[PDB]
Amino acid sequence: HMASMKKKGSVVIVGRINLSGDTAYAQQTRGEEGCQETSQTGRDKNQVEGEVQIVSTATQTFLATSINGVLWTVYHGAGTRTIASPKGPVTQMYTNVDKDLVGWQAPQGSRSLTPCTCGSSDLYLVTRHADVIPVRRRGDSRGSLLSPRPISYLKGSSGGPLLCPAGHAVGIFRAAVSTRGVAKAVAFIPVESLETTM
Ligand SMILES: COc1ccc2nc(C)c(O[C@@H]3C[C@H]4C(=O)N[C@]5(C(=O)NS(=O)(=O)C6(C)CC6)C[C@H]5/C=C\CCCCC[C@H](NC(=O)OC5(C)CC5)C(=O)N4C3)nc2c1
Ligand SMILES: [Zn+2]
């Protein structure tokens, strides 16, 4: 009934992939209880750092990546949800179900990756476990893993970046192509598709 209608909570930043130094590692910045509370209020007073955030809703967890001042992620994770911020929920500034893409203004304190213009096909996928996985680009939106592995290892990493050797953003991880549960290839939203939507 109209009286009891609920609203979906915000996407919440719950951690980050630290790429500051020589060793990549995940950091949690908010636990599940505080995540649920922040999703309901949409008010997140935590300091944000870095390029790759770990994000969560009430039911899903995935990644979000800042490129050119926009925090980008997948529509299949975030839907049309707002993101929590220090002054309340923030509405998406980009939404494209056809590309499986959404974006919000990048949070204060984040660092943005630069869009790649190298034209290189030797890529690196960053997962939610801070694994850096070499990927050979195979098309506009596809790459093959140099070392295949079960899809379990990639689950929860949509919204993460594919980077070039120079650390530029080449695309946003969207889907994993597997055979008998082994991921052989990935699909991603190319950064040019991001740059066009901007
Ligand atoms: C609803 O509106 C939509 C609009 C556009 C759209 N466009 C898609 C391509 C899309 O594809 C969905 C979600 C993707 C996923 O699972 N994305 C990862 C991930 O990690 N998600 S996640 O866990 O973070 C999670 C669920 C958010 C919390 C990166 C995958 C890691 C493991 C694969 C597991 C088996 C799943 C393997 C599967 N292959 C696959 O479709 O291959 C093809 C044929 C090349 C496509 C896959 O990858 N997807 C299935 N859905 C939408 C939904
Ligand atoms: Zn580059």
PDB file of N, CA and C in Angstrom, residues 127-175:
ATOM      1  N   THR A 127      41.104  -6.648  -8.948  1.00  0.00           N
ATOM      2  CA  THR A 127      39.950  -7.274  -8.322  1.00  0.00           C
ATOM      3  C   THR A 127      39.734  -6.742  -6.906  1.00  0.00           C
ATOM      4  N   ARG A 128      38.580  -7.110  -6.341  1.00  0.00           N
ATOM      5  CA  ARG A 128      38.215  -6.704  -4.999  1.00  0.00           C
ATOM      6  C   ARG A 128      39.111  -7.327  -3.944  1.00  0.00           C
ATOM      7  N   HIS A 129      39.880  -8.353  -4.295  1.00  0.00           N
ATOM      8  CA  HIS A 129      40.879  -8.931  -3.402  1.00  0.00           C
ATOM      9  C   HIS A 129      42.266  -8.350  -3.640  1.00  0.00           C
ATOM     10  N   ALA A 130      42.353  -7.275  -4.425  1.00  0.00           N
ATOM     11  CA  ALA A 130      43.590  -6.584  -4.777  1.00  0.00           C
ATOM     12  C   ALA A 130      44.529  -7.453  -5.603  1.00  0.00           C
ATOM     13  N   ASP A 131      44.004  -8.491  -6.241  1.00  0.00           N
ATOM     14  CA  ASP A 131      44.773  -9.191  -7.259  1.00  0.00           C
ATOM     15  C   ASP A 131      44.889  -8.304  -8.489  1.00  0.00           C
ATOM     16  N   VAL A 132      46.072  -8.299  -9.103  1.00  0.00           N
ATOM     17  CA  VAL A 132      46.309  -7.593 -10.353  1.00  0.00           C
ATOM     18  C   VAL A 132      46.542  -8.659 -11.417  1.00  0.00           C
ATOM     19  N   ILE A 133      45.572  -8.818 -12.312  1.00  0.00           N
ATOM     20  CA  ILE A 133      45.458  -9.960 -13.212  1.00  0.00           C
ATOM     21  C   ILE A 133      45.801  -9.486 -14.624  1.00  0.00           C
ATOM     22  N   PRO A 134      46.877  -9.981 -15.231  1.00  0.00           N
ATOM     23  CA  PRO A 134      47.152  -9.620 -16.630  1.00  0.00           C
ATOM     24  C   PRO A 134      46.071 -10.134 -17.569  1.00  0.00           C
ATOM     25  N   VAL A 135      45.667  -9.249 -18.481  1.00  0.00           N
ATOM     26  CA  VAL A 135      44.612  -9.462 -19.463  1.00  0.00           C
ATOM     27  C   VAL A 135      45.099  -8.913 -20.801  1.00  0.00           C
ATOM     28  N   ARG A 136      45.017  -9.730 -21.843  1.00  0.00           N
ATOM     29  CA  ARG A 136      45.337  -9.290 -23.195  1.00  0.00           C
ATOM     30  C   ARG A 136      44.061  -8.775 -23.848  1.00  0.00           C
ATOM     31  N   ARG A 137      44.086  -7.542 -24.319  1.00  0.00           N
ATOM     32  CA  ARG A 137      42.909  -7.000 -24.981  1.00  0.00           C
ATOM     33  C   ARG A 137      42.666  -7.759 -26.276  1.00  0.00           C
ATOM     34  N   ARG A 138      41.404  -8.146 -26.506  1.00  0.00           N
ATOM     35  CA  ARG A 138      41.012  -8.970 -27.650  1.00  0.00           C
ATOM     36  C   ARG A 138      39.988  -8.280 -28.543  1.00  0.00           C
ATOM     37  N   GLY A 139      39.485  -7.120 -28.143  1.00  0.00           N
ATOM     38  CA  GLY A 139      38.520  -6.384 -28.939  1.00  0.00           C
ATOM     39  C   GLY A 139      38.214  -5.076 -28.245  1.00  0.00           C
ATOM     40  N   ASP A 140      37.186  -4.386 -28.733  1.00  0.00           N
ATOM     41  CA  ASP A 140      36.812  -3.126 -28.108  1.00  0.00           C
ATOM     42  C   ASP A 140      36.383  -3.312 -26.657  1.00  0.00           C
ATOM     43  N   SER A 141      35.760  -4.436 -26.329  1.00  0.00           N
ATOM     44  CA  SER A 141      35.181  -4.583 -25.000  1.00  0.00           C
ATOM     45  C   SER A 141      35.503  -5.916 -24.353  1.00  0.00           C
ATOM     46  N   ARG A 142      36.531  -6.615 -24.852  1.00  0.00           N
ATOM     47  CA  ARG A 142      36.873  -7.970 -24.415  1.00  0.00           C
ATOM     48  C   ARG A 142      38.379  -8.104 -24.190  1.00  0.00           C
ATOM     49  N   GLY A 143      38.741  -8.941 -23.222  1.00  0.00           N
ATOM     50  CA  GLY A 143      40.133  -9.310 -23.001  1.00  0.00           C
ATOM     51  C   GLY A 143      40.207 -10.730 -22.483  1.00  0.00           C
ATOM     52  N   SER A 144      41.325 -11.399 -22.757  1.00  0.00           N
ATOM     53  CA  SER A 144      41.528 -12.765 -22.276  1.00  0.00           C
ATOM     54  C   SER A 144      42.472 -12.764 -21.081  1.00  0.00           C
ATOM     55  N   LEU A 145      42.162 -13.594 -20.084  1.00  0.00           N
ATOM     56  CA  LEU A 145      43.064 -13.746 -18.951  1.00  0.00           C
ATOM     57  C   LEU A 145      44.282 -14.550 -19.369  1.00  0.00           C
ATOM     58  N   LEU A 146      45.468 -14.061 -19.010  1.00  0.00           N
ATOM     59  CA  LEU A 146      46.673 -14.824 -19.309  1.00  0.00           C
ATOM     60  C   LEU A 146      46.719 -16.096 -18.481  1.00  0.00           C
ATOM     61  N   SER A 147      46.148 -16.059 -17.283  1.00  0.00           N
ATOM     62  CA  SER A 147      46.085 -17.229 -16.408  1.00  0.00           C
ATOM     63  C   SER A 147      44.621 -17.385 -16.017  1.00  0.00           C
ATOM     64  N   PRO A 148      43.865 -18.221 -16.718  1.00  0.00           N
ATOM     65  CA  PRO A 148      42.465 -18.439 -16.352  1.00  0.00           C
ATOM     66  C   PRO A 148      42.323 -18.919 -14.917  1.00  0.00           C
ATOM     67  N   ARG A 149      41.151 -18.673 -14.347  1.00  0.00           N
ATOM     68  CA  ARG A 149      40.885 -19.136 -12.993  1.00  0.00           C
ATOM     69  C   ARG A 149      39.384 -19.163 -12.768  1.00  0.00           C
ATOM     70  N   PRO A 150      38.923 -19.880 -11.748  1.00  0.00           N
ATOM     71  CA  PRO A 150      37.476 -20.031 -11.561  1.00  0.00           C
ATOM     72  C   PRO A 150      36.794 -18.682 -11.407  1.00  0.00           C
ATOM     73  N   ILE A 151      35.537 -18.624 -11.837  1.00  0.00           N
ATOM     74  CA  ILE A 151      34.828 -17.348 -11.807  1.00  0.00           C
ATOM     75  C   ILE A 151      34.645 -16.859 -10.381  1.00  0.00           C
ATOM     76  N   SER A 152      34.702 -17.767  -9.407  1.00  0.00           N
ATOM     77  CA  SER A 152      34.642 -17.386  -7.999  1.00  0.00           C
ATOM     78  C   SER A 152      35.608 -16.268  -7.660  1.00  0.00           C
ATOM     79  N   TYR A 153      36.782 -16.275  -8.302  1.00  0.00           N
ATOM     80  CA  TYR A 153      37.828 -15.304  -7.978  1.00  0.00           C
ATOM     81  C   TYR A 153      37.516 -13.923  -8.512  1.00  0.00           C
ATOM     82  N   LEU A 154      36.655 -13.825  -9.527  1.00  0.00           N
ATOM     83  CA  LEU A 154      36.277 -12.546 -10.113  1.00  0.00           C
ATOM     84  C   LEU A 154      34.948 -12.020  -9.590  1.00  0.00           C
ATOM     85  N   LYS A 155      34.128 -12.879  -8.975  1.00  0.00           N
ATOM     86  CA  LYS A 155      32.836 -12.457  -8.455  1.00  0.00           C
ATOM     87  C   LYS A 155      33.030 -11.349  -7.431  1.00  0.00           C
ATOM     88  N   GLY A 156      32.254 -10.279  -7.573  1.00  0.00           N
ATOM     89  CA  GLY A 156      32.344  -9.130  -6.698  1.00  0.00           C
ATOM     90  C   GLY A 156      33.290  -8.050  -7.173  1.00  0.00           C
ATOM     91  N   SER A 157      33.898  -8.216  -8.353  1.00  0.00           N
ATOM     92  CA  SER A 157      34.864  -7.263  -8.869  1.00  0.00           C
ATOM     93  C   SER A 157      34.330  -6.433 -10.025  1.00  0.00           C
ATOM     94  N   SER A 158      33.068  -6.611 -10.423  1.00  0.00           N
ATOM     95  CA  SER A 158      32.503  -5.712 -11.427  1.00  0.00           C
ATOM     96  C   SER A 158      32.606  -4.282 -10.924  1.00  0.00           C
ATOM     97  N   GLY A 159      32.820  -3.357 -11.853  1.00  0.00           N
ATOM     98  CA  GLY A 159      33.068  -1.984 -11.502  1.00  0.00           C
ATOM     99  C   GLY A 159      34.525  -1.647 -11.300  1.00  0.00           C
ATOM    100  N   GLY A 160      35.397  -2.652 -11.220  1.00  0.00           N
ATOM    101  CA  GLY A 160      36.818  -2.430 -11.105  1.00  0.00           C
ATOM    102  C   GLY A 160      37.429  -2.053 -12.432  1.00  0.00           C
ATOM    103  N   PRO A 161      38.665  -1.559 -12.375  1.00  0.00           N
ATOM    104  CA  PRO A 161      39.342  -1.118 -13.586  1.00  0.00           C
ATOM    105  C   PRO A 161      40.175  -2.186 -14.274  1.00  0.00           C
ATOM    106  N   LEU A 162      40.215  -2.040 -15.593  1.00  0.00           N
ATOM    107  CA  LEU A 162      41.305  -2.519 -16.419  1.00  0.00           C
ATOM    108  C   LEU A 162      42.205  -1.333 -16.719  1.00  0.00           C
ATOM    109  N   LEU A 163      43.500  -1.501 -16.447  1.00  0.00           N
ATOM    110  CA  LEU A 163      44.528  -0.485 -16.588  1.00  0.00           C
ATOM    111  C   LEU A 163      45.556  -0.899 -17.636  1.00  0.00           C
ATOM    112  N   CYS A 164      46.182   0.099 -18.251  1.00  0.00           N
ATOM    113  CA  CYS A 164      47.280  -0.118 -19.182  1.00  0.00           C
ATOM    114  C   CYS A 164      48.610  -0.223 -18.430  1.00  0.00           C
ATOM    115  N   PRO A 165      49.722  -0.494 -19.109  1.00  0.00           N
ATOM    116  CA  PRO A 165      50.986  -0.593 -18.366  1.00  0.00           C
ATOM    117  C   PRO A 165      51.338   0.670 -17.599  1.00  0.00           C
ATOM    118  N   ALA A 166      50.917   1.838 -18.092  1.00  0.00           N
ATOM    119  CA  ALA A 166      51.201   3.118 -17.455  1.00  0.00           C
ATOM    120  C   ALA A 166      50.203   3.481 -16.357  1.00  0.00           C
ATOM    121  N   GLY A 167      49.293   2.588 -16.010  1.00  0.00           N
ATOM    122  CA  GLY A 167      48.356   2.877 -14.944  1.00  0.00           C
ATOM    123  C   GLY A 167      47.175   3.732 -15.343  1.00  0.00           C
ATOM    124  N   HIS A 168      46.918   3.895 -16.642  1.00  0.00           N
ATOM    125  CA  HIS A 168      45.722   4.596 -17.079  1.00  0.00           C
ATOM    126  C   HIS A 168      44.528   3.655 -17.132  1.00  0.00           C
ATOM    127  N   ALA A 169      43.326   4.244 -17.059  1.00  0.00           N
ATOM    128  CA  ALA A 169      42.084   3.473 -17.110  1.00  0.00           C
ATOM    129  C   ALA A 169      41.762   3.133 -18.555  1.00  0.00           C
ATOM    130  N   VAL A 170      41.615   1.851 -18.828  1.00  0.00           N
ATOM    131  CA  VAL A 170      41.201   1.380 -20.149  1.00  0.00           C
ATOM    132  C   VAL A 170      39.731   0.974 -20.188  1.00  0.00           C
ATOM    133  N   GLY A 171      39.169   0.551 -19.056  1.00  0.00           N
ATOM    134  CA  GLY A 171      37.759   0.193 -19.056  1.00  0.00           C
ATOM    135  C   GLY A 171      37.295  -0.221 -17.679  1.00  0.00           C
ATOM    136  N   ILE A 172      35.994  -0.493 -17.588  1.00  0.00           N
ATOM    137  CA  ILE A 172      35.338  -0.898 -16.346  1.00  0.00           C
ATOM    138  C   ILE A 172      34.850  -2.339 -16.499  1.00  0.00           C
ATOM    139  N   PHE A 173      35.311  -3.215 -15.609  1.00  0.00           N
ATOM    140  CA  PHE A 173      34.968  -4.640 -15.639  1.00  0.00           C
ATOM    141  C   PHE A 173      33.469  -4.843 -15.472  1.00  0.00           C
ATOM    142  N   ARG A 174      32.869  -5.581 -16.410  1.00  0.00           N
ATOM    143  CA  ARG A 174      31.428  -5.784 -16.485  1.00  0.00           C
ATOM    144  C   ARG A 174      31.021  -7.243 -16.336  1.00  0.00           C
ATOM    145  N   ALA A 175      31.669  -8.154 -17.051  1.00  0.00           N
ATOM    146  CA  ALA A 175      31.219  -9.538 -17.064  1.00  0.00           C
ATOM    147  C   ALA A 175      32.391 -10.470 -17.312  1.00  0.00           C
TER     148      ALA A 175
END
